[PDB]
Structure 1
Amino acid sequence: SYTNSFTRGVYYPDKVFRSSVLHSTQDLFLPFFSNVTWFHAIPVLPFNDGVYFASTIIRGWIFGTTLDSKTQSLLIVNNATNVVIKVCEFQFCNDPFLDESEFRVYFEYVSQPFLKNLREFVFKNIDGYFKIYSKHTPIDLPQGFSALEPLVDLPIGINITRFQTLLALHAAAYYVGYLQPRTFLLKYNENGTITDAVDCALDPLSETKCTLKSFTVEKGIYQTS
């Protein structure tokens, strides 16, 4: 099933604070009005760059290159106490699933867990790192705008080629997006929150707003590109 994503998927490109200015950034974001493969499964998914993830019950994310013990692989399991991120040469099944005291799937990083609402997660894999972004905002994606604050950084080093999700056996559905490199224009507020993002490759008014570094344009002629 396919469903258009209106405007969501905006995360902080850095940890730099800004106050009521406009900051042109060129990083890897989620484009606006791009279709996402809204699943309804109750296999394996390709990884280009980015696992923009949103669901409204499921916990777990398989990451790796071959998914097997031939090279390093990543594992994330979230429960009520903490989060364990185990990286090793781990052997996985074709369709792993959970049970909650028994493990049927087959350095660690113990911190606070990642817990109607909508758990929006944006994943990145560049410069040998791994970055988790999240924002639990209560409510076909709903019409609105919100930021995605950063979280812990995991030094891995290897490249990620394929990924998979998990099913938590007590299900639900989750959106999957894909990021591509482009340029946004983000409007920081006075307090320092991202509240409005405008693209730079859309209908030409958006590109004019990108190339004039302003949100409001007057009548006239503008040469852009």
Structure 2
Amino acid sequence: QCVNLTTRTQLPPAYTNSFTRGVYYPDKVFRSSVLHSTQDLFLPFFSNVTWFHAIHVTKRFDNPVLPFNDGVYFASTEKSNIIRGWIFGTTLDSKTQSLLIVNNATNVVIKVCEFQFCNDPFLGVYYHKNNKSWMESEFRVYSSANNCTFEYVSQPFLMDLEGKQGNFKNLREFVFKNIDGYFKIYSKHTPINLVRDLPQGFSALEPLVDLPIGINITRFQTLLALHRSYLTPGDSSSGWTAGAAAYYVGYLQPRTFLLKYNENGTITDAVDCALDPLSETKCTLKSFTVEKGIYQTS
């Protein structure tokens, strides 16, 4: 069904900086001690991206429909799994084949049907009193479905449905790219331990799967979730909670990057060729130990 929410007070998003993020394998070919320069959609280093928040401690629940660009680096630091799935499409009104990749606790359902999306869809998790458990009951994702073009049921993945107010423990790195109608997903999980900003660790994302859905993706929206409790009536108005989750939304840009491979085929360093004047010289000379002597740029 479609149960809208009451106009509440939101918080303005912050602005964080990236520390070597949005780096993945540009190809599925093994390399060792080679320095090649390819054209792949990557993320520029030392960039100011938008920092969205969703902590209940107030009533923060922002989910705008930003236009989908060429390559979106979705970095979400969730300790209790608040963000369920994501939606993709153009108009989202039971008129075009919209892509729905939801990650429910029951299973992974990826259906590309004409789902009638509401004004502000979310997920409702009811808290039972007879037993200490957290199960999802409200499925306010789509009103109804008509024709379908691709339906796949993956392996069941159990998630956490208990919203807490602690620090982040797990980092879910995802990259969504829609080039030539093909949807490429880059899933990579890595445990972290921080409270703000981005970690200084290296980015090494692996490609998940490539489903040739062949649709036109224009706008997207991050589907969040809501929790219930015995102290609240449970209505979708103002008496509920959303936990605490901070995800980073970064748009990729076509920049030439110089990939470095070791003796095991694992990328350990990424030198950009379009950022700082010092980093641009190492990309042209194809080296990393710049000594004395004058050099030429362009």
TM-score (norm 2): 0.71
Could you tell me how far apart the structure 2 residues matched to 1:10 and 1:96 are?
Answer: 31
Contact 2:74–2:247 (8 Å) recurs in 1: yes
> Is the 8 Å Cα contact of residues 200 and 206 (structure 1) preserved in structure 2?
yes
Distance 1:113 1:39 in 2: 29
- The question of 1:74 aligning with 2:102 is answered no
Deviations 1:14-50 (A, max 9, x none): 1111012222111111111111111114631222222
Q: Distance in 1 between matches of 2:33 and 2:105?
A: 38
Mind listing any 5+ residue stretches in structure 1 that lack a counterpart? none
DSSP 3-state at the match of 1:101 = strand
> Shift of the alpha carbon at 1:206?
0.8
Say yes or no: does 1:219 pair with 2:292: yes
Distance 1:134 1:160 in 2: 19
Contact 1:133 1:148 in 2 (8 A): yes
Paired residues of 2:274 and 2:280 also in contact (CA < 8 A)? yes
Q: Deviations over 1:83-129 (max 9, x none)?
A: 1111022210121001x143211212222467912111111110220
Question: Aligned residue for 2:202?
Answer: 145
SS of 2:284's equivalent in the other structure is helix
- Indicate whether 1:182 and 2:235 are aligned: no
Q: CA deviation at 1:219?
A: 1.5
Would you say 1:97 and 2:130 are equivalent positions? no
Aligned residue-pair number: 224
SS in 2 for 1:118: strand
1:46 is the counterpart of 2:40: no
Whole-angstrom CA distance in 1 between matches of 2:151 and 2:289: 49
Contact 1:5 1:36 in 2 (8 A): yes
Q: Distance in 2 between matches of 1:219 and 1:123?
A: 43
Q: CA RMSD in A?
A: 1.9
- Rounded Cα–Cα distance in structure 2 between residues aligned with 1:127 and 1:14: 17
How far the C-alpha of 1:198 sits from its partner, in A, is: 0.8
In the other structure, the counterpart of 1:110 is: 153
Rounded to whole Å, the distance in 1 between the matches of 2:92 and 2:185 is 20
Runs in 1 of length 4+ with deviation above 3 angstroms? 112-115
Write out per-residue CA displacement over residues 64-93 of structure 1, whole angstroms, 9 at most, x where no aligned residue. Answer: 111222211010111345311110222101
Q: State how far apart, in whole Å, the 2-side matches of 1:148 and 1:111 are.
A: 21
Which secondary structure state, in structure 2, belongs to the residue aligned with residue 125 of structure 1? Answer: strand
CA distance in 2, matches of 1:105, 1:113: 19
Answer whether contact 1:78 1:113 (CA < 8 A) is retained.
Answer: no
Contact 2:20 2:203 (8 Å CA) reproduced: no
CA distance in 2, matches of 1:146, 1:105: 32
Distance (whole Å) between structure 2 residues aligned to residue 220 and residue 124 of structure 1: 42
Is the Cα contact below 8 Å between 1:45 and 1:163 reproduced in 2?
yes
Q: What's the TM-score once normalised by structure 1's chain length?
A: 0.93
Structure 1 residue 143: Cα displacement: 1.2
Taking a change above 3 Å as real, the CA distance of residues 118 and 69 of structure 1, as seen in their structure-2 partners, is same
Please report how far the alpha carbon of residue 169 of structure 1 lies from its aligned counterpart in structure 2 after TM superposition: 2.4
Largest Rg, 1 or 2: 2
- Of residues 178-187 and 44-53 in structure 1, the stretch that sits farther from structure 2 once superposed is 44-53
2:184 maps to 131
Residue in structure 1 matching 2:112, options 87, 112, 121: 87
C-alpha contact 2:44 2:275 (8 A) present in aligned 1: no
Aligned partners of 1:126, 1:196: CA distance in 2, in Å?
26
**Which piece of structure 1 moves more, 199-208 or 80-89?**
80-89
Q: 1:110 to 1:203 in 2, by over 3 A?
A: same
Summarize deviations over 1:119-157 as a string: whole Å, max 9, x none: 111111102200111221122001121301111111121
**What are the Cα deviations for residues 137-187 of structure 1, in whole angstroms up to 9, with x where unaligned?**
122001121301111111121221110011122441211000111100111
CA contact (8 A) 1:97 1:104 kept: yes
Partner SS, residue 179 of structure 2: coil
